[PDB]
Amino acid sequence: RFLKVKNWETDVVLTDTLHLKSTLETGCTEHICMGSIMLPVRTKDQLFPLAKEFLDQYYSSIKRFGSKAHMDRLEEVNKEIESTSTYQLKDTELIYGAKHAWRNASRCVGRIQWSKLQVFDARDCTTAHGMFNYICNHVKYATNKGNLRSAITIFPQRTDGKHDFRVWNSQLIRYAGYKQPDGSTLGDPANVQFTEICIQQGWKAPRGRFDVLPLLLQANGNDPELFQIPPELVLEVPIRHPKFDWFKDLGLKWYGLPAVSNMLLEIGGLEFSACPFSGWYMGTEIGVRDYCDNSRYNILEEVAKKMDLDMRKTSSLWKDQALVEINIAVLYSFQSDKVTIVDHHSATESFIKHMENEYRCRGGCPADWVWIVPPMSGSITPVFHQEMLNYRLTPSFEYQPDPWNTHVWKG
Amino acid sequence: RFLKVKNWETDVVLTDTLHLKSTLETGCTEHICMGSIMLPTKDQLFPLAKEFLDQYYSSIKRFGSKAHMDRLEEVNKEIESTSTYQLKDTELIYGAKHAWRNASRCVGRIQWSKLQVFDARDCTTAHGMFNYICNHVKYATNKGNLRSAITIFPQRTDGKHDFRVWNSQLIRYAGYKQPDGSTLGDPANVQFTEICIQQGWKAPRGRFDVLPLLLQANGNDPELFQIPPELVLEVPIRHPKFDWFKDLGLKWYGLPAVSNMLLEIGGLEFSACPFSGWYMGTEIGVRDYCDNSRYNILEEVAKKMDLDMRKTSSLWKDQALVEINIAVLYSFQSDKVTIVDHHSATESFIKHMENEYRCRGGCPADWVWIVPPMSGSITPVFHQEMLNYRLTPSFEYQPDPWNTHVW
């Protein structure tokens, strides 16, 4: 069953066959689309089949499908699973796995870079201090003095679900958020809950508007431990505008390395609950969402004032005018300081090329339009005009519940 | 069964039960989401009429009354007899209003109950259609104080006697393919602009030439008619700061009137049902003016603004986009022609969603179409989870007539 997607701006039509290999569910039915919904211990029984599908894809990728090496690997894993109820991936398989989870991430517009992922194998890690060390190395390698490199660090996989490794932070680097008694929020509102947990764990909060949070790391199902990332390892960019000299006076800045650290990486049935990964920012992430979401730093009003914009009536599009400026400032500041960053026009054009390539060389490219289209200037980016098919392939990156909601504290 | 949708900016959570009354398909499956795809018998008829009549009577608090049973029986007999049926006026009006109520891609539905319905089922010729359409346009335009309306021509019978408005909108600008290879006017209408000529229209070959109506009645071939210019309200586009803006030579019409859709009520198909409301600014400023395959005007505007168009990262396209859309809203307002900005419109939709959830148990909505084409996340709908599903009565797409007509 073939399926075609059309780009209404170029009339280019593509045919998708890859969706046929999709096994997981979407959340949608023939009766309802849940396309805009944010979030719509395994058994030996269910493990080997997942393992075989993976190994089959892996061996095909290296052109050794059906070889003796392939067959022996299946036999070996089968035995190991029956013998230990789980199995260990070879280094080669882990790298292939991690790269494909990124390749299969439908919400990611930066996937044209998927094959260049640097994979750090932290499966020999046993303690939080060990985790802290791997994480520091990942940040230094990835930051590369501003010339960012994509990377992922993979800690030991889940076993019985009672010895999980977890990074409690949502990103390796992020700013604290503090709820004030007058109801206002100091810092980043998105991290208030986590910030409270850190303080409760012993962190001495400096209580400023841009305090880098400490790492709260959990190894082998133990209680999480706090660690401060060496400041010299955290690259930050002061935000200023190329034409407005007062912009710098807003005292804004952001970190250069975006590193999601709360997702779960699934490979051949195995679950890697601590798999922090990083790339580089697309401007709008900071400029539109982190700075202008009403629930984030919410700086639109203050910026519009300084610009002396008609804020009497929305139809003056004062919000839209200020948004552009703020986004111009983010891109400008990063570029001046030579910290890697990509604007939405450039990133989306690249994704379209990546997508076309994938259809031609792979038979498709699962993509989530709701997420792919930038939060500003939607239709002036090619992705808006591009029809997309969203479906779940493994290996994959999945959401998981915040650990403070599931953790059995030991004291 | 009972689905919940959350607004991530306000934490407000709504529970959707209305979807349980969904009847049509979405194009999606448990294995694949096609949410961004633009276009995913007497025995057949009676159940549909029944479903409709039941909701109709339920709506008037006479569910299961004699009147209900009676009407049900009457239509039933009429169908078994005529193989079809006719809606009472009350039912026609309710059907049309609800078709708008159920249009998941429309962000202006808070106005659904105020729809003026013009019953043109007694129409029989293209001239007749032209007359009905002129009246609709004048009524809806109302000197700039726009009023929503829909005119409903005769329903389908055998499919060989269909009424159809060939234009895609009652009022639209012509598009001509020049030797240069480039396109003059509106590229979206290059083709239709040709079928008119292939029919006799004397194209003034301009940038904003109001197209002619090409009307099809009872199945016969379509005819051309020039809408009285005094009936076409237009707005000269100028900027409230860039005097050079007016120089751009831009203008647009004030009445958006989709004319190529099909209205389905109780199984009955109305293939010619033009309807109009009023514009949301971005429709013109972002889509019509800046789409690459439309009037594609960003470069010129950026130029005049003297912006650094060397690097995409200077965001000249975005800056220009903003100014343009400022000018559309400014013009319309200055000429007292109804128009709504995407901020005000989206705020209204959120309120409408809430009302709909509490008074009806839900509101089918297509996020991909609801979120405006610019400044997405600074509008509230961006942060609003939505459930898309098909409820009837509804407005459906249908093949362009020139790809089905047997001259």
Ligand code: HEM
């Ligand atoms: C090279 C630079 C990269 C760019 C420019 C890029 C861009 C983006 C953007 C703009 C988003 C949406 C983020 C949001 O709205 O919160 C995103 C999402 C995503 N990306 Fe990428 N990305 C990059 C690298 C990576 C890497 C290295 C991985 C994985 C190995 C990855 C995995 C994902 C996933 C799984 C999501 C969805 C996360 C969620 O659901 O919250 N990306 N990316």
Ligand code: HEM
């Ligand atoms: C009163 C003012 C109204 C406003 C502000 C409004 C706004 C909008 C907007 C912004 C769109 C998207 C247009 C596009 O992208 O092409 C839309 C679509 C739609 N609206 Fe409304 N609308 C209004 C009245 C109407 C009326 C009166 C009806 C029908 C009775 C209606 C039916 C629909 C339908 C069926 C669609 C989707 C059409 C398609 O698929 O191309 N709208 N509306």
Ligand SMILES: C[C@H](O)[C@H](O)[C@H]1CNc2nc(N)[nH]c(=O)c2N1
């Ligand atoms: C409710 C809606 O799904 C939600 O606000 C989505 C929309 N698109 C998005 N797109 C990206 N890239 N990131 C997001 O966080 C979101 N949020």
Ligand SMILES: C[C@H](O)[C@H](O)[C@H]1CNc2nc(N)[nH]c(=O)c2N1
């Ligand atoms: C391919 C994609 O579905 C297409 O470009 C959609 C996106 N969202 C839209 N939203 C609205 N309101 N109108 C449109 O025409 C579209 N086009």
Ligand SMILES: NC(=[NH2+])NCCC[C@H](N)C(=O)O
């Ligand atoms: N380009 C990326 N790798 N993004 C990861 C998500 C970062 C998140 N959206 C932020 O604004 O901090």
Ligand SMILES: NC(=[NH2+])NCCC[C@H](N)C(=O)O
């Ligand atoms: N507001 C409306 N009723 N719009 C109907 C569709 C009009 C179309 N989007 C246009 O720009 O011409």
Ligand SMILES: [Zn+2]
């Ligand atoms: Zn769907």
